Write a protein that binds this ligand. Structure first.
Ligand code: MG
Ligand code: MG
Ligand code: MG
Ligand code: MG
Ligand code: MG
Ligand code: MG
Ligand code: MG
Ligand code: MG
Lengths: 475, 470
């Protein structure tokens, strides 16, 4: 008897002609939070509320106020309702400063000794955060104006301010906030300026349920609350916060993959890899993906002997390259690859860069060894998808700091992503292992990965939120 | 019989001006002076590392111990361990902002550093040898003792308790760490054999002490995270592991009354007619002088600081460590940029290890800034208000151990937020004599009880209770 409203900020939508119909088409770039949320919209048969961040988006939204019919990579179709944030007030929706600070904080990118140093920009950014949060919350509230019993599913870190605003207007509504990124240790969270470190928590706590992909993130969130909000009472065993009349439950809801989204190799790759064992590292152009260290670990593994007919493919998916840290990462990866080739012989290691899902899947299929060695990762879905499609009983080296390691770590070669020697030794061992050992390990790994579907995760959201809503009422 | 050990002893060997005989004296400040003063308090020898040929010569020539003069005036015996020089050199590298200093004092960005190679494997091996040298020295000194008590000080000796416990199953062993303990997620940046091996080395202690509750909490979380076989109790502050029961204790330290002069050359004249902001600390990136200078510039831009100057007092220490050299460069850069904007000679750097100069700067200050990025405790934030003659406000980082005792009596700041720090500089200097007078008196009252002798008593009392429980 409830209507469900699902929102997230980022929607990477292209507009082109549909070859099937010859009509103008909206389609969603693959990967990122957007693809996950869009698939959830499809599972639930509801619209996806997200931000218009271009004239094209505004134009599409104005012509289709009921929503734009959008095509997923999985071929599936949903309605997307893009919020037409006023272009004169919100000049650049694509990049919000406060959200970018939260990205760096939550993914641990600062050394503290030299960075960060917050100036007036952080104050201005926080004011802008407030304006955007209000504009977004108002759009959700307008969308749900004809609903007597709305259920709000608010997705990802850009919307951390939203639950407080929804709770103010809809005191009895079930509200889930689901964060797709890590939550950092209390000492690290409090690097942020006082108004932001506390303000964000004030924005989140009015949610019925706060979800993360991993237990570690829930624990770190609770510790952050205990550290900063003298008014709050945490219960580490119950995973609860009680604060200013808000009761909040923290839940872990792991996600692995979408079965319905699971081709030929990129140009030149099949011939280059022929007769060689192939090590594959795959991920976005983001320093957390840790390809530089993966390449250096490969070089150290080769130094120990036994990798004579082995090559390494670094698959990088271009994304937000305008961010200085991302550009720096690509530079550092290119440098390590050049050093590897200088040391091991030309063409031992190759970078292959695009956002083509078919190429990604092909590379997952061809791999003799898969490396997902993130410095940290909210979850990392590639580490579920890859073994599920791999045909060669490839081993998987998985960083212990990926959310996914809580589910898959015991079925992979779990590593410290900062230790090049451990990683080199894991690379050597994985490639030395005989086919029967690898076959049995891969079968167990597929069995461990298989249950963690997008639909199961959506069900977890609803089951958790429903239970927490009941508990909130009883208290 | 109490046995006391710590690694670092910065000793100078010269001729005693009063007697003409050979003399050994200990550098003031740092952990060495603290442990040396504790040896004096307890009337015991201090076991420490010989770190140079002169130390080895002195140790070899005086096997009973080297009579060593402390800055406070006192005299104690130091028993210096002659390690293998190659092992020692590499271990000292392991203990600097390479490796362990960055691990416990939060110096890594994770995205680009660290990346552990074979050097970390060799470093760990050498650390084991160094640890064995210390345990053998301590055991040798205590071998005929029926009921020895072991007080093992600071992070370099984290491996020692396990080795002592192996030989002395029933002995009281305190491990007291003088630096922070990092969050669990940060601790596990270290290679597996190190992150776990260090915990295995520490947990056999009867008692593990830190200067702050936060460090104890972070330690427990690290144990819970890495040792599936350990059981922690956050309320009892205990670890139960392999039938070892370990108690975690917070034992704050503030200052030594006995250690509490003229200003350095040129400073008095330069400061005359001006309000003086003083930042003081070792050449270590945790001391955060660069951000303090930038915050000062931001405050000066706002007006109201027209007759205000800033003194950056830096105590040269291990300038060969890249992170320390970089820190000094960044501070020099910020000071030059401050002067280029605000006017020549607005900000000065003054560098030496003269305690008298430090105390004098504390006395002269109209505002004191101890804005460390993190600090195991920071003793300067107790010493400075207790000697200051201006009722200077204190800007104190919330990330100093000392903030747990003095935070509410100072202007507590986020050390990464320049605007907050600038606003605190401005507010601190907007208040004249009387406003500050009341707060300054309450601050001194808060700082006063936290003496060195009280802290030594806390060590003994805590250890005794924990030993009787185990
Ligand atoms: Mg758009
Ligand atoms: Mg931390
Ligand atoms: Mg985890
Ligand atoms: Mg890659
Ligand atoms: Mg010496
Ligand atoms: Mg040392
Ligand atoms: Mg951390
Ligand atoms: Mg210092």
């Amino acid at each position: 008897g409830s209507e469900i409203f699902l929102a997230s900020k980022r929607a990477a939508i292209t507009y082109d002609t549909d070859p099937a119909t010859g009509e103008p088409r909206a389609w969603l770039a693959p990967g990122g939070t957007g693809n996950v949320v869009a698939e959830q919209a499809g599972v639930l048969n509801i619209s996806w509320i997200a931000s218009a961040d271009s004239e094209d988006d505004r134009r599409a939204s104005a012509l289709n106020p009921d929503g734009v019919t959008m095509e997923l990579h999985s071929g599936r179709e949903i309605l997307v309702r893009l919020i037409r944030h006023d272009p004169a007030v919100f000049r650049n929706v694509q990049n919000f400063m406060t959200a970018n600070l939260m990205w760096a904080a939550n993914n641990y990118g600062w050394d503290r000794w030299t960075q960060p140093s917050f100036g007036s920009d952080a104050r201005e950014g926080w004011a802008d955060f407030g304006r955007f949060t209000r504009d977004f919350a108002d759009a959700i509230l307008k969308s749900s104006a004809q609903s007597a019993d709305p259920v709000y599913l608010v997705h990802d870190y850009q919307l951390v301010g939203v639950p407080a605003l929804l709770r103010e207007q809809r005191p009895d509504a079930p509200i889930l906030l689901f964060v797709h990124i890590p939550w950092p240790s209390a000492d690290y969270w409090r690097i942020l300026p006082k108004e932001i470190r506390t303000g964000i928590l004030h924005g989140m706590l009015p949610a019925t349920t706060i979800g993360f992909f991993a237990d570690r993130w829930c624990r770190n969130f609770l510790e952050s609350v205990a550290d900063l909000l003298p008014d709050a009472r945490i219960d580490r065993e119950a995973m609860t916060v009680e604060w200013r009349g808000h009761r909040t439950r923290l839940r872990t809801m792991p996600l692995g993959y979408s079965p319905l989204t699971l081709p030929q190799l990129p140009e030149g790759i099949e011939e280059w890899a022929d007769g060689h064992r192939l090590v594959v590292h795959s991920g976005r152009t983001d320093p957390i993906k840790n390809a530089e260290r993966a390449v250096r670990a490969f070089v150290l593994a080769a130094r120990g002997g036994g990798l004579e007919k082995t090559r390494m493919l670094v698959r990088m998916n271009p994304n937000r390259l305008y961010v200085p840290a991302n550009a720096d990462y690509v530079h550092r990866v290119e440098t390590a690859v050049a050093e590897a080739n200088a040391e091991l012989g030309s063409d031992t290691v190759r970078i292959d860069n695009d956002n083509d899902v078919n190429h990604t899947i092909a590379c997952f299929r061809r791999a003799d060894l898969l490396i997902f060695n993130s410095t940290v990762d909210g979850q990392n879905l590639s580490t579920f998808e890859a073994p599920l499609v791999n045909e060669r009983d490839a081993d998987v080296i998985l960083s212990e700091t990926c959310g996914a390691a809580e589910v898959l770590g015991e079925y992979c070669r779990s590593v410290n992503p900062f230790d090049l020697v451990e990683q080199a030794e894991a690379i050597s061992a994985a490639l030395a292992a005989g086919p029967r050992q690898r076959a049995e390990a891969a079968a167990r790994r597929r069995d461990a990965a298989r249950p963690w579907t997008l639909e199961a995760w959506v069900q977890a959201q609803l089951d958790g939120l429903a239970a927490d809503h009941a508990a909130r009422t009883a208290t």
